[PDB]
Amino acid sequence: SEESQAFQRQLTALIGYDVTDVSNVHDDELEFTRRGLVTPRMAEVASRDPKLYAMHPWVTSKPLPEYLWKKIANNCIFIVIHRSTTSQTIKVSPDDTPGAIDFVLRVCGRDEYLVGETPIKNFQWVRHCLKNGEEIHVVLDTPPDPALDEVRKETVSLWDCDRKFRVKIRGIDIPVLDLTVFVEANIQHGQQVLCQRRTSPKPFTEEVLWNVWLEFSIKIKDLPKGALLNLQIYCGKVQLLYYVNLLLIDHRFLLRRGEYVLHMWQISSFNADKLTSATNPDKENSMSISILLDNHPIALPKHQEMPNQLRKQLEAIIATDPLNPLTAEDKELLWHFRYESLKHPKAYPKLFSSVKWGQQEIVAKTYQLLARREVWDQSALDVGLTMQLLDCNFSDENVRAIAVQKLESLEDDDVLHYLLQLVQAVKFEPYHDSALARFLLKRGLRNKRIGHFLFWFLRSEIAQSRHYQQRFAVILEAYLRGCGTAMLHDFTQQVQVIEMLQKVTLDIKSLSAEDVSSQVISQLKQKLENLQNSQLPESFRVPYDPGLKAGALAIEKCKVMASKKKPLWLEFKCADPTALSNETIGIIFKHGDDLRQDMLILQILRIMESIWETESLDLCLLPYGCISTGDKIGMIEIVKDATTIAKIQQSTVGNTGAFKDEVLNHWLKEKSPTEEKFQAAVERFVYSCAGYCVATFVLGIGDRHNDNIMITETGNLFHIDFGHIKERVPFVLTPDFLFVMGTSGKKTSPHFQKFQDICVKAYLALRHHTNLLIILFSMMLMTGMPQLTSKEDIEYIRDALTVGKNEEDAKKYFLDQIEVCRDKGWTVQFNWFL
């Protein structure tokens, strides 16, 4: 039809990629995945309560922390319900379910609802108000129409083959380039290379032919599902220059066969891009390789105590961190005591790394082993452990599926906490259709807030990653076909706004030399007025805060920043008349940088906060909204009432940097209305500073120049610009920070004794989740930093978290770091200014 044609055109423009396109395939996996995702979409759509879907209550079933209880007025919270101009105020108790006080309670100025069978202490908006110490303002409203969510009507056994595996390398071709070059062919399973063959070296001409069979030692019957033929091109120590990958057992369990011309990826170690089954879309410029797979259709089938010192050796092995390398001795031990090891969920990652995946009978015993998993199925969810099983070390669908099984029990509050890393982990899936892809699909469709962030996270990777754009596009399409017309319209509006603003960023960045022109400010405001009538939708959801709807631009307040990437400083009015403010919505619109590294670090900061909540600590971090939106384009939340530490020094002192200890402290008092609020500022500063000292040490991003650090007018310290990373320093504890606490060079202050108190406790709390943080750190580097990441980069966090050390000793180690910062004073800060 035509209605079912212009709708795909709509899907395409929302997705940023054409999913029906077959210009860059060599089998039908992508198309097979589209048809396969119809079923899980349908089930989730059909079983979601239409009413609860449309109001999307954002709820938690976690306990209310000790830091929030001490801020109640003894078992009583205040809720202001609203008329038109006036308002009524109700006395409430934390257990009063929405219905205890048709009509619905919508938060003033936000598409956020207080509805459903949960106590009001179990709402995030309520806990937000309580955290910042603000009154809850709501409106008696009409529930939205679920009709707006309406969804438009949518043979030889392999184990019977003793032949050794063989692949014919016909040769390579490249339109443009000289030394010597050879092709390496690896049977891979995860990062585990099972068998390796090389060709003879040949001269590197624009076309090089071999026509040789490479006979491997692995038999066909021993090929596991998810095994990759990985083809690499080395020039000559040698050097890797091109790689492509091909699945040996395709999506139907059929062995791969016939002719292949694969266009290959260029090189700029452990990196997610290296594992992709996607071929290079750049048909014109990219190197290709011509191969022949030949062996009748062959299909893989599906299937239907110990001594003292050894138990101890095994337990020591199970105890070690996820980055502790297993020796052959350890693996052989784990596998032999297979069934003892299965009694310990913590042993699953190491045990499944003890499996000889290239030996058919071993795999069979491994699948037998998984069939007997009462203990695994019974234990409480550990995200750490579960994440470990989704990383690049595991390619077995069954192994990976028992990880996804655990995630299924995750409450929506926590999916949101791990969504970004979960979406990144799709890049570790051998096949386009995986249990994890389906999990993300149905959790997103069950919940408008997960689905909103799912959209952007997926879209972020489609726009700037060729290596996985096809896979993420299919999954995104499957999502959009279930999210419902009311969300398709939001997405459409958001896409239009950022596409429009992009154009304005482009032409403006070119009109400036490498400060800021005066004409240019008027030139920007000129084009922004041009938009306000043009075709700009006069209300769109804020990508990083889907509660807020933005309306008209506040043109007068809009400017180009003094940064040499010339980002746009934009302000918007809230489209909601029910808003009881006036404060504009401030968004930084940036080109030049890829915001994905920033997204990752910030999300990890959030994870660190929720970690700290389990131990009733609130280190007042400020992880501001930051959404990559397109290719090298995104938005950043403007934090109100904030300035950079550096600018505070350029206000009292001046240019070069004769830094003074007092300058921060009396900046605080001049922005403090009273002594009452000034102390709360010093209070907020002690916590903030403690959070960012700990967080950044662990992540190894603590040494920042002080224009990249900010403070709010109420004490809240917070770091910025994470997407960038001699004598070193563990973090930033400069004298101006230290004097706010009341110390100079070598002393101890009451507020400082608190800083040391909170850090030590925050640090040790993180250490109780060593495994989880190690795994998120590993995954971050492998999927987020195109840094050809090494073990040594990863095994930094082993140092930072003082693995294998007692608590006493870990307290000492960090306290040394504090003292290291003291010794340097201003040496590192001045050193940047070269």
Ligand X SMILES: O=S(=O)(Nc1cc(-c2ccc3nccc(N4CCOCC4)c3c2)cnc1Cl)c1ccc(F)cc1
- Which residues belong to the annotated binding site? 586-595, 621-629, 718-725
Instruction: Report if residue 563 touches ligand X, rule: CB under 6 A.
Output: yes
Instruction: Report if residue 644 touches ligand X, rule: CB under 6 A.
Output: yes
CA–CA gap between residue 181 and residue 339 (Å, rounded) = 48
Nearest distance from residue 719's CB to ligand X, in Å?
9
Radius of gyration of the chain (CA): 29
Strand 77-82 relative to strand 87-92, pairing: antiparallel
Closest CA to 442 of 479, 400, 390: 479
CA–CA gap between residue 825 and residue 710 (Å, rounded) = 19
Q: Which residues 398-427 are close enough to bind ligand X by CB under 6 A?
A: none
Give phi and psi for 731, each to the nearest 5.
Answer: -155, -165
Selected range binding ligand X among 30-38, 80-88, 560-568, 673-681, rule: CB under 6 A: 560-568
Selected range binding ligand X among 15-23, 133-141, 673-681, 720-728, rule: CB under 6 A: 720-728
C-beta closer to ligand X: residue 317 or 528: 528
Nearest distance from residue 586's CB to ligand X, in Å?
7
Selected range binding ligand X among 20-28, 202-210, 719-727, 763-771, rule: CB under 6 A: 719-727
Closest CA to 709 of 545, 569, 832: 832
Selected range binding ligand X among 17-25, 309-317, 667-675, 717-725, rule: CB under 6 A: 717-725
Instruction: Report if residue 701 touches ligand X, rule: CB under 6 A.
Output: no
Out of 381, 642, 682, 815, the residue judged to bind ligand X by CB under 6 A? 642
Instruction: Report if residue 557 touches ligand X, rule: CB under 6 A.
Output: no
CA–CA gap between residue 337 and residue 149 (Å, rounded) = 53
Compute how many residues bind ligand X; rule: CB under 6 A.
18
Q: Which residues 147-166 are close enough to bind ligand X by CB under 6 A?
A: none
Out of 322, 444, 484, 567, the residue judged to bind ligand X by CB under 6 A? 567
C-beta closer to ligand X: residue 414 or 721: 721
Closest CA to 235 of 167, 184, 185: 184
CA–CA gap between residue 432 and residue 445 (Å, rounded) = 19
Instruction: Report if residue 457 touches ligand X, rule: CB under 6 A.
Output: no
8 Å CB contact between 169 and 185: yes
8 Å CB contact between 186 and 196: yes
Selected range binding ligand X among 124-132, 332-340, 410-418, 561-569, rule: CB under 6 A: 561-569
DSSP symbols for 757-812? HHHHHHHHHHHTTHHHHHHHHHHHHHHH-TTT--HHHHTTHHHHTTTT--HHHHHH
Nearest distance from residue 136's CB to ligand X, in Å?
26
C-beta closer to ligand X: residue 588 or 803: 588
- Residue showing tokens 């910042």: 132
Q: Which residues 723-762 are close enough to bind ligand X by CB under 6 A?
A: 723
Instruction: Report if residue 565 touches ligand X, rule: CB under 6 A.
Output: yes
C-beta closer to ligand X: residue 224 or 567: 567
Type of residue at 679: Q
Nearest distance from residue 386's CB to ligand X, in Å?
31
C-beta closer to ligand X: residue 152 or 640: 640
Instruction: Report if residue 638 touches ligand X, rule: CB under 6 A.
Output: yes
CA 161 to chain centre: 43
Nearest distance from residue 599's CB to ligand X, in Å?
11
Type of residue at 82: H
CA–CA gap between residue 589 and residue 557 (Å, rounded) = 14
C-beta closer to ligand X: residue 68 or 639: 639
Selected range binding ligand X among 205-213, 293-301, 347-355, 634-642, rule: CB under 6 A: 634-642
Nearest distance from residue 722's CB to ligand X, in Å?
7
The Cα-based distances of 62 to 119, 123, 125, 691, 711 in angstroms read 12, 10, 14, 22, 30
Which residues are bridge partners to 290 per DSSP?
171, 261
Nearest distance from residue 631's CB to ligand X, in Å?
16
Selected range binding ligand X among 108-116, 157-165, 406-414, 715-723, rule: CB under 6 A: 715-723
Closest CA to 598 of 567, 570, 617, 625: 625
Q: What is the torsion angle, in degrees rounded to the nearest 10, for the CA atoms of residue 784, residue 786, residue 787 and residue 793?
A: 20
8 Å CB contact between 16 and 630: yes
Nearest distance from residue 612's CB to ligand X, in Å?
22
8 Å CB contact between 474 and 37: yes
8 Å CB contact between 584 and 573: yes
Element at 131 (helix H, strand E): helix 124-132
**HEC profile for 716-758?**
CEEECCCCCCCCCCCCCCCHHHHHHHCCCCCCCCHHHHHHHHH
C-beta closer to ligand X: residue 557 or 805: 557
C-beta closer to ligand X: residue 129 or 636: 636
Out of 588, 608, 664, 797, the residue judged to bind ligand X by CB under 6 A? 588
Instruction: Report if residue 521 touches ligand X, rule: CB under 6 A.
Output: no
Residues 6+ apart with CB under 8 A from 440: 419, 422, 423, 426, 454, 475
Out of 218, 531, 561, 818, the residue judged to bind ligand X by CB under 6 A? 561
C-beta closer to ligand X: residue 216 or 572: 572
Nearest distance from residue 544's CB to ligand X, in Å?
11
Closest CA to 731 of 774, 776, 762, 765: 762
Instruction: Report if residue 358 touches ligand X, rule: CB under 6 A.
Output: no
C-beta closer to ligand X: residue 645 or 698: 645
Type of residue at 597: Q
Selected range binding ligand X among 15-23, 469-477, 498-506, 558-566, rule: CB under 6 A: 558-566
Out of 720, 785, 815, 818, the residue judged to bind ligand X by CB under 6 A? 720
C-beta closer to ligand X: residue 78 or 830: 830
Annotated binding site for ATP: 586-595, 621-629, 718-725
Instruction: Report if residue 590 touches ligand X, rule: CB under 6 A.
Output: yes
C-beta closer to ligand X: residue 106 or 591: 591
The alpha helices in 484-515, defined as continuous H runs, are 485-510
C-beta closer to ligand X: residue 80 or 642: 642
Instruction: Report if residue 624 touches ligand X, rule: CB under 6 A.
Output: yes
CA–CA gap between residue 670 and residue 27 (Å, rounded) = 67
Out of 493, 708, 749, 787, the residue judged to bind ligand X by CB under 6 A? 708
Residues that bind ligand X (CB under 6 A): 561, 563, 565, 567, 588, 590, 598, 624, 636, 638-639, 642, 644, 707-708, 720-721, 723
